[PDB]
Amino acid sequence: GAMDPGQGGGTHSQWNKPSKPKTNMKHMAGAAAAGAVVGGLGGYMLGSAMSRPIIHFGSDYEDRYYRENMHRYPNQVYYRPMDEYSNQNNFVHDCVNITIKQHTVTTTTKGENFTETDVKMMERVIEQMCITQYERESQAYYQRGSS
Numbered sequence: 001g002a003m004d005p006g007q008g009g010g011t012h013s014q015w016n017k018p019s020k021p022k023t024n025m026k027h028m029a030g031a032a033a034a035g036a037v038v039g040g041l042g043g044y045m046l047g048s049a050m051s052r053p054i055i056h057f058g059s060d061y062e063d064r065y066y067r068e069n070m071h072r073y074p075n076q077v078y079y080r081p082m083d084e085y086s087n088q089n090n091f092v093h094d095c096v097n098i099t100i101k102q103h104t105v106t107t108t109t110k111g112e113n114f115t116e117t118d119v120k121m122m123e124r125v126i127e128q129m130c131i132t133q134y135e136r137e138s139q140a141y142y143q144r145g146s147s
Contacts, residue, residue, distance in 0.1 A: 034080045041078055044098055049075035052125045066121045072112065074103060077126050088138055095130040096123065 028042050035045030052073060056063050066073075079095040082088050100123040107114040 038078060040102055041098065044078055044080055047077050047079060050077075050129070051075075052122075053128065055124050055128065057121070057124060062121070069118075073122055074099075074107075077129060078102070079130060082133075082138060089134070092130045092134045092138075096127045099123075099126050 031043045033043040035041070035043060038044060038046045040046075052070065052075060054063065054067060077096075077099040079098055080091045083091065100119065103122065104114075104119050107119065
């Protein structure tokens with residue numbers, strides 16, 4: 001017979017530059033941490049996705065606005081734990097502020113377009129959240145003693 005033609009080949013897509021990991025962290029050793037050290041706060045803790053209540057402020061227009069849009073609103077909050085001293089009344093004031101401190105920019109930087117009118121809605125529904133535990137739980141051990 002004749003000598004039949006032949007062909008062949010191959011690729012070299014089986015190698016890359018090495019990518020061994022290195023420590024790429026940030027440390028704040030001088031931070032007076034009182035919480036579980038959430039990476040967004042460093043010295044505070046993060047709570048559960050507890051239900052967000054409905055609170056009126058300006059009008060029922062604002063109420064229904066928040067109610068309809070609540071599907072995009074955050075569910076969990078950030079705070080410090082309590083303490084058994086007079087500081088218990090001080091930290092509860094900043095507790096609610098810790099969540100909104102980050103959340104003002106956290107919403108928009110996630111692909112949202114919240115304005116001041118929108119973020120004040122979420123800061124008030126969390127405001128009562130730290131107050132209610134003060135008058136419910138913190139008042140309980142205070143009023144009854146612990147011994």
